[PDB]
Amino acid sequence: QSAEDLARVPANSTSNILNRLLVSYDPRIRPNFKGIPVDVVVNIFINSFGSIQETTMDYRVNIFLRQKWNDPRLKLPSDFRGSDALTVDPTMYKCLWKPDLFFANEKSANFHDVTQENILLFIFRDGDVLVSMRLSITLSCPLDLTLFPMDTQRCKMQLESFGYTTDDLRFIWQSGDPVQLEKIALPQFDIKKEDIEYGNCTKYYKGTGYYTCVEVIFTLRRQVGFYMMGVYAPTLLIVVLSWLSFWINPDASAARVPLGIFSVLSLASECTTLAAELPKVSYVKALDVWLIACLLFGFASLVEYAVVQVMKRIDLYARALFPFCFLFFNVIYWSIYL
């Protein structure tokens, strides 16, 4: 603070005569104090996007949160030409004002400190201050998996101000390619740059001001192939098996016994075995509707066996009605829940 000098030429002497020793650049008060609102220009750059836990409703994402604004109190003097970007080290990162943004739906955010600190700050000639920082956030998006094996989840990330209203701080995107991302592979979902829809949405918190905010809305379409080749076509095959079991002879035979007692057992031991693999969420999902319909059809097959052996005239109607009755449900279900 009160140290006289160490050097006069390089890019540290200009910072020493710019703040914390020279004329008061108070890092507590914003630029254009009681004047115009500061305009922060944010543009994240996603490096990783994963672990969408359907039991906690969160997703982890690593960004490069670049934010760039205009501070007229850091106007670099014309003594030099080589310091077009006066690079201040993060030891003095707190000696100059920085906008206090925060993610309004984060859960446990933290910085990165591998081999160095991961914050870079530039100060330009015309006063434009630039702050890049690597960040590892875990935001929360409310997953509504009612249409579970065919659902589309929108998950949004919203940056906000913390203590500065709209007439003091104001966020705007870079207006050219503001949310970039690397080639990233979700385990179950499918992130797509075609829908990266973003926008401003300021909040009107009552009594105290009108705080600024921006947000990105990713859209994830859960791909269906494992479920379709998993718990759809073998289960439909089990039901079709128990349909075609009506073609075995009942007259002087005993071989429809296993084809009943093992059809219903197999469909039940498929249903309640699947009941652990699915996400543990206690409301009606479309897959559960499919499973209960297939179990109802297996039960219907065995009760048709019962009614033809408690009462040629019923089997010929069942074989042509109920495998034809499956088709209406298989049309309306994939028309409604898809």
Binding site: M57, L135, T272, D288, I292, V303
Partner: protein, 339 residues
């Protein structure tokens, strides 16, 4: 002039101010008007008995040692780093399991001093609060997962917390939980600790949770009830045609045992009897009863055939009455009364 030295002229070293003496020392206690604003909610985990909530917390209190009328700027802001200079009331969540602040891109605290000395202190915490749950009646229950704010070191003769009037606890809209549905009726209340040292203020809030049984109906009630009806239909046949009746009995008992296995495979890990395990043991018992009815009919049948048809008709009239009586008792005692 500027705020950053006006705070040094108000609370700093030159002026008279102390950072660990409460307002109105040796007088009336300080009334902290505390309210919260939750954002997230979840991880309500019945294996460790604790949920996790991510709240904003606003405490506002007055101290005339910061009353100023020197210049018209009526909203002073302290940075969240020199926050040890002002006096701020201690507050610890008396049932937490581990909890901490947020420090992303800035410090997530705020301290705004007004003109009349009324200061307003807003923090952003995440909390792993403990909640003693009760799964005696699992798929039809209510949890009264609560949350307390208690003073630490200051008795009720020195500091008193009180909720804000106009909706103290709020909820961020569009808040979905994977299991429960948080009610719109949250009961704010006055807890109070009466310990050997003194009496300590303790405000509290009680959320009500309701587990929605829609998945358990479609996956574990309807199939088992269907299997019980199928086990009826098994011995509802008239003659002694063996393989159909034996087939349906073996079918029903195998699928009921497999249902019970999977129900243990997916449900919470709790070692006392739950209202879903009662209803599975009873269905297993009824399929056992139908198989035993068939075995008894075969054991008496080789006069004998007349008594065999008589006990068959009596059981075919009695088992629906028995299951209806059980189902009536079960659903009244679990869905209606303890609700």
């Amino acid at each position: 002039l500027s705020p950053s030295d006006f705070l040094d002229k108000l609370m700093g070293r030159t002026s008279g101010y102390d950072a660990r003496i409460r307002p109105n020392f040796k007088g009336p206690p300080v009334n902290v008007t505390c309210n919260i604003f939750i954002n997230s909610f979840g991880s309500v985990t019945e294996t460790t008995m604790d949920y996790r909530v991510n709240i904003f917390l606003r405490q506002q209190w007055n101290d005339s040692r910061l009353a100023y009328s020197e210049y018209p700027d009526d909203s002073l802001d302290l940075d969240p780093s020199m926050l040890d200079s002002i006096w701020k009331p201690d507050l610890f969540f008396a049932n937490e399991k581990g909890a901490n602040f947020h420090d992303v891109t800035t410090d997530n605290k705020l301290l705004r001093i007004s003109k009349n000395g009324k200061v307003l202190y807003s923090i952003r915490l995440t909390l792993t609060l403990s909640c003693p749950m009760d799964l005696k009646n699992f798929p039809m229950d209510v949890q009264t997962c609560t949350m307390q704010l208690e003073s630490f070191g200051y008795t009720m003769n020195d500091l008193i917390f009180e909720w804000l009037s106009d909706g103290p606890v709020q909820v961020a809209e569009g808040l979905t939980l994977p299991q429960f549905i948080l009610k719109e009726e949250k009961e704010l209340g006055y807890c109070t600790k009466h310990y050997n040292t003194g009496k300590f203020t303790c405000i509290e809030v009680k959320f009500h949770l309701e587990r929605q049984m829609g998945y358990y109906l479609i996956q574990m009630y309807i199939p088992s009830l269907l299997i019980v009806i199928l086990s009826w239909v098994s011995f509802w046949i008239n003659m002694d045609a063996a393989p159909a009746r034996v087939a349906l009995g073996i079918t029903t008992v195998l699928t009921m045992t497999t249902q019970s296995s999977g129900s243990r495979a997916s449900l919470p890990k709790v070692s006392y009897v739950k209202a879903i395990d009662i209803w599975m043991a009873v269905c297993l018992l009824f399929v056992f009863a139908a198989l035993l009815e068939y075995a008894a009919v075969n054991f008496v049948s080789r006069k004998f055939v007349d008594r065999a048809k008589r006990i068959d008709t009596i059981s075919r009239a009695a088992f629906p009455l028995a299951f209806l009586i059980f189902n009536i008792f079960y659903w009244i005692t679990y869905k209606i009364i303890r609700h």
